[PDB]
Design an enzyme around this catalytic site. Sequence first.
Site, mmCIF file in Angstrom:
data_model
loop_
_atom_site.group_PDB
_atom_site.id
_atom_site.type_symbol
_atom_site.label_atom_id
_atom_site.label_comp_id
_atom_site.label_asym_id
_atom_site.label_seq_id
_atom_site.Cartn_x
_atom_site.Cartn_y
_atom_site.Cartn_z
ATOM 1 N N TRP A 92 1.419 -6.445 0.765
ATOM 2 C CA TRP A 92 0.631 -5.801 -0.282
ATOM 3 C C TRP A 92 -0.876 -5.900 -0.124
ATOM 4 O O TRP A 92 -1.618 -5.395 -0.966
ATOM 5 C CB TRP A 92 1.015 -6.361 -1.654
ATOM 6 C CG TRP A 92 2.238 -5.743 -2.248
ATOM 7 C CD1 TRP A 92 3.473 -6.314 -2.361
ATOM 8 C CD2 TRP A 92 2.344 -4.446 -2.844
ATOM 9 N NE1 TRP A 92 4.333 -5.459 -2.992
ATOM 10 C CE2 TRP A 92 3.669 -4.302 -3.299
ATOM 11 C CE3 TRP A 92 1.438 -3.387 -3.040
ATOM 12 C CZ2 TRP A 92 4.121 -3.142 -3.940
ATOM 13 C CZ3 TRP A 92 1.886 -2.233 -3.678
ATOM 14 C CH2 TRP A 92 3.216 -2.121 -4.120
ATOM 15 N N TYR B 15 4.644 -3.052 -11.006
ATOM 16 C CA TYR B 15 6.030 -3.508 -11.207
ATOM 17 C C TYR B 15 6.243 -4.746 -12.068
ATOM 18 O O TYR B 15 6.789 -4.644 -13.165
ATOM 19 C CB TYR B 15 6.730 -3.711 -9.862
ATOM 20 C CG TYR B 15 6.633 -2.533 -8.925
ATOM 21 C CD1 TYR B 15 7.444 -1.412 -9.092
ATOM 22 C CD2 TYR B 15 5.726 -2.542 -7.861
ATOM 23 C CE1 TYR B 15 7.355 -0.326 -8.216
ATOM 24 C CE2 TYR B 15 5.632 -1.463 -6.980
ATOM 25 C CZ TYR B 15 6.448 -0.360 -7.160
ATOM 26 O OH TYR B 15 6.382 0.688 -6.267
ATOM 27 N N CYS C 13 6.808 3.549 -6.711
ATOM 28 C CA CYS C 13 7.685 4.391 -5.893
ATOM 29 C C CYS C 13 9.104 4.287 -6.432
ATOM 30 O O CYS C 13 9.752 5.299 -6.707
ATOM 31 C CB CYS C 13 7.639 3.965 -4.432
ATOM 32 S SG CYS C 13 6.061 4.336 -3.684
ATOM 33 N N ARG D 160 10.915 7.907 -6.507
ATOM 34 C CA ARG D 160 10.190 9.178 -6.461
ATOM 35 C C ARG D 160 9.610 9.543 -5.099
ATOM 36 O O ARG D 160 9.549 10.719 -4.738
ATOM 37 C CB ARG D 160 9.084 9.209 -7.520
ATOM 38 C CG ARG D 160 8.036 8.141 -7.358
ATOM 39 C CD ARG D 160 6.652 8.661 -7.659
ATOM 40 N NE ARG D 160 5.664 7.653 -7.307
ATOM 41 C CZ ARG D 160 4.805 7.757 -6.299
ATOM 42 N NH1 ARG D 160 4.751 8.860 -5.562
ATOM 43 N NH2 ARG D 160 3.960 6.763 -6.066
ATOM 44 N N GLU E 83 8.930 -11.125 -2.575
ATOM 45 C CA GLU E 83 8.370 -10.050 -3.379
ATOM 46 C C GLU E 83 9.178 -9.930 -4.674
ATOM 47 O O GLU E 83 8.609 -9.759 -5.753
ATOM 48 C CB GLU E 83 8.400 -8.724 -2.621
ATOM 49 C CG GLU E 83 7.721 -7.583 -3.381
ATOM 50 C CD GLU E 83 8.041 -6.221 -2.817
ATOM 51 O OE1 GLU E 83 9.224 -5.950 -2.516
ATOM 52 O OE2 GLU E 83 7.105 -5.413 -2.673
HETATM 53 C C1 LIG Z 1 7.277 -2.504 0.099
HETATM 54 N N1 LIG Z 1 6.014 -2.439 0.917
HETATM 55 C C2 LIG Z 1 4.861 -2.064 0.058
HETATM 56 C C3 LIG Z 1 4.507 -0.626 0.160
HETATM 57 C C4 LIG Z 1 3.310 -0.095 -0.562
HETATM 58 N N2 LIG Z 1 2.645 1.057 0.141
HETATM 59 C C5 LIG Z 1 3.283 1.663 1.181
HETATM 60 N N3 LIG Z 1 2.702 2.702 1.810
HETATM 61 C C6 LIG Z 1 3.350 3.342 2.822
HETATM 62 N N4 LIG Z 1 2.912 4.520 3.254
HETATM 63 N N5 LIG Z 1 4.572 2.906 3.246
HETATM 64 C C7 LIG Z 1 5.183 1.833 2.691
HETATM 65 N N6 LIG Z 1 6.405 1.459 3.080
HETATM 66 C C8 LIG Z 1 4.548 1.162 1.638
HETATM 67 N N7 LIG Z 1 5.205 0.224 0.952
HETATM 68 C C9 LIG Z 1 5.972 -2.558 2.297
HETATM 69 C C10 LIG Z 1 7.181 -2.692 3.028
HETATM 70 C C11 LIG Z 1 7.167 -2.868 4.416
HETATM 71 C C12 LIG Z 1 5.934 -2.914 5.124
HETATM 72 C C13 LIG Z 1 5.952 -3.183 6.578
HETATM 73 O O1 LIG Z 1 4.941 -3.190 7.289
HETATM 74 N N8 LIG Z 1 7.160 -3.442 7.117
HETATM 75 C C14 LIG Z 1 7.551 -3.842 8.502
HETATM 76 C C15 LIG Z 1 6.942 -5.214 8.851
HETATM 77 C C16 LIG Z 1 7.236 -6.330 7.838
HETATM 78 C C17 LIG Z 1 6.273 -7.507 7.936
HETATM 79 O O2 LIG Z 1 5.052 -7.303 7.751
HETATM 80 O O3 LIG Z 1 6.738 -8.651 8.159
HETATM 81 C C18 LIG Z 1 9.071 -3.854 8.710
HETATM 82 O O4 LIG Z 1 9.529 -3.225 9.688
HETATM 83 O O5 LIG Z 1 9.792 -4.464 7.887
HETATM 84 C C19 LIG Z 1 4.709 -2.749 4.419
HETATM 85 C C20 LIG Z 1 4.736 -2.573 3.020
HETATM 86 O O1 LIG Z 2 8.486 0.171 -2.119
HETATM 87 C C1 LIG Z 2 7.930 1.142 -1.620
HETATM 88 C C2 LIG Z 2 6.522 1.435 -1.834
HETATM 89 C C3 LIG Z 2 5.964 2.572 -1.252
HETATM 90 N N1 LIG Z 2 6.694 3.399 -0.511
HETATM 91 C C4 LIG Z 2 5.938 4.571 0.013
HETATM 92 C C5 LIG Z 2 6.150 5.970 -0.572
HETATM 93 C C6 LIG Z 2 4.982 6.752 0.013
HETATM 94 O O2 LIG Z 2 5.284 6.920 1.421
HETATM 95 C C7 LIG Z 2 3.748 5.837 -0.120
HETATM 96 C C8 LIG Z 2 3.107 5.962 -1.507
HETATM 97 O O3 LIG Z 2 2.364 7.233 -1.592
HETATM 98 P P1 LIG Z 2 2.401 8.171 -2.864
HETATM 99 O O4 LIG Z 2 3.794 8.655 -2.927
HETATM 100 O O5 LIG Z 2 2.036 7.419 -4.061
HETATM 101 O O6 LIG Z 2 1.480 9.305 -2.749
HETATM 102 O O7 LIG Z 2 4.431 4.502 0.007
HETATM 103 C C9 LIG Z 2 8.059 3.202 -0.245
HETATM 104 O O8 LIG Z 2 8.753 3.952 0.421
HETATM 105 N N2 LIG Z 2 8.608 2.064 -0.822
#
Ligand SMILES: CN(Cc1cnc2nc(N)nc(N)c2n1)c1ccc(C(=O)N[C@@H](CCC(=O)O)C(=O)O)cc1
Ligand SMILES: O=c1ccn([C@H]2C[C@H](O)[C@@H](COP(=O)(O)O)O2)c(=O)[nH]1
Lengths: 264, 264
Positions: free
Chosen positions: A80, A94, A146, A166, A58
């Site tokens: 993503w 980003y 974020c 944030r 990433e």
């Molecule tokens: C940085 N990222 C993008 C991203 C964008 N929207 C979001 N939305 C929510 N609510 N939460 C997030 N963490 C999130 N983050 C992420 C990070 C981890 C995982 C996740 O599923 N993590 C697991 C599994 C990782 C994998 O899929 O291999 C772990 O325990 O590390 C998903 C999205």
């Molecule tokens: O790198 C990242 C990307 C996303 N989020 C999380 C923040 C929120 O839980 C959600 C995004 O929702 P909003 O804050 O935009 O409403 O994904 C993280 O913690 N780390």
Amino acid sequence: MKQYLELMQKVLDEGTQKNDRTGTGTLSIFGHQMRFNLQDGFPLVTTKRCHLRSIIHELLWFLQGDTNIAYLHENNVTIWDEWADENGDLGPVYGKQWRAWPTPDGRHIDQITTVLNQLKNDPDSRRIIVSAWNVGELDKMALAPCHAFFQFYVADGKLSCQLYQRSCDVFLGLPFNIASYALLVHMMAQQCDLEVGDFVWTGGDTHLYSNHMDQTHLQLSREPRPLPKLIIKRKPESIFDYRFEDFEIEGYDPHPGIKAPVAI
Amino acid sequence: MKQYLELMQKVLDEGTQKNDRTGTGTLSIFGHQMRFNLQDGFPLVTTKRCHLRSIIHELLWFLQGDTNIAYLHENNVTIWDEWADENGDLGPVYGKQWRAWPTPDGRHIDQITTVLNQLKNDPDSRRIIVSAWNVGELDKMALAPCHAFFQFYVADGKLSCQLYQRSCDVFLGLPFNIASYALLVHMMAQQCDLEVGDFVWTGGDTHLYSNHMDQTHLQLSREPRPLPKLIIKRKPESIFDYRFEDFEIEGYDPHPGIKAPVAI
Ligand SMILES: CN(Cc1cnc2nc(N)nc(N)c2n1)c1ccc(C(=O)N[C@@H](CCC(=O)O)C(=O)O)cc1
Ligand SMILES: O=c1ccn([C@H]2C[C@H](O)[C@@H](COP(=O)(O)O)O2)c(=O)[nH]1
Ligand SMILES: CN(Cc1cnc2nc(N)nc(N)c2n1)c1ccc(C(=O)N[C@@H](CCC(=O)O)C(=O)O)cc1
Ligand SMILES: O=c1ccn([C@H]2C[C@H](O)[C@@H](COP(=O)(O)O)O2)c(=O)[nH]1
């Protein structure tokens, strides 16, 4: 990690119940800061197994200025997928802001390169910043940044960095975010011939989703293992020339992984 | 204030000597956070007398979207004289970014109006942010924004705010900045029918200029007195209709002021 586990406990101890965009529900605190001395070890969570392959890819993707998930897909990274459109586009997120922030007069600013030049010619500057928070383009983004703002600092020949996040998903997001930035600091320090300093994390709405409670308490019952070590096997001509193979993480012995649902 | 004096001491004990932009030299630390429960009183320094007229007029000036010091002079405020040009302009600084952030396509975003509407229609939002860090207009500004990024938060009917200050002059700037943002939260809370919460201050390069050491030592020997109370005498039709006449401070009994030169 000690600081990470303390943050979780804090969210549980003094967090308020809040409804959110996803309609899931969160336990939340506002404002928190924690420091990681990079010389102590690479801050990769050990109380649960983390997937470093996705973190590295990433980051390289961000540095390329890419916003389409194709690259991530050919490297089997699917973090993503839920936010991309039919064409795999995420909008000017980003990557685009880092490498080509659009000005109103037709120019485009490469924040990563400008930061590299500042670290080399003016390391004492108090303006060594990178921002992903482009107010005028937020409507075109699949998701608002974020981790939206970060600043570098140099002292005693060491490179430090503070990030302002944030919104923070403490269980899923945070472990990924910390490792991501700790890695960038290592790459920046190697390019500027500096040693690694501290990674300071600052959060806004720091939260734990309602459906992550059992997992959170399961993780909290675990004792952290010693922090892994990061070994970079090469020094590329530029910060944009790193490959996945240049990185080696040793001494990583984590507790078993804990699966949890992402809130879209 | 207690936490303010603690930070002042911290810089002295742990600060690194740095040759800064001005060439005056500073003692600085990187990464710090302070929280101020606004329910406990207005965070206006009592260990030295601070003047509210400069603070209040600058804030109202910001909310006007004005970037020319003409208004400030009409009200005997001279804080932006050393950076303004022959015509009194400062360039697209704070005021312009808050009220009319320019998009690449010519449009303008009113961050304050947006924030007001979010607080009133979507209080649980984790995106209630105002940014003055416009990378594309940075070169056109007389001075890059110090207090560059702030986020609002609502929980239990209380409004909180966290500010990210990239560069901080602990002695001169800090007391002004804290009071400036505490005031805005009060105006925002009144206009959105919410109670006041916490003001979280986060800093990057937090420093103490070498030619302020005597003044710092003087202030550090003074015992902080109880915090004052802010009273807003009239509730205007909008956040843009406040006047200097509308603000009153009760119980402010500070130690005499301390004079110190400004590093331009
Ligand atoms: C940085 N990222 C993008 C991203 C964008 N929207 C979001 N939305 C929510 N609510 N939460 C997030 N963490 C999130 N983050 C992420 C990070 C981890 C995982 C996740 O599923 N993590 C697991 C599994 C990782 C994998 O899929 O291999 C772990 O325990 O590390 C998903 C999205
Ligand atoms: O790198 C990242 C990307 C996303 N989020 C999380 C923040 C929120 O839980 C959600 C995004 O929702 P909003 O804050 O935009 O409403 O994904 C993280 O913690 N780390
Ligand atoms: C917020 N502001 C704008 C501003 C712009 N550039 C700066 N540049 C320098 N390096 N330092 C600053 N504090 C500063 N701040 C300020 C803040 C305080 C004073 C100042 O001199 N204040 C009181 C200080 C009185 C006292 O020290 O007790 C005075 O009236 O003299 C000037 C500008
Ligand atoms: O609201 C403000 C404006 C300025 N400064 C200070 C920070 C630095 O001491 C100097 C600006 O210098 P640079 O960081 O841009 O170099 O003025 C503050 O502390 N608060």
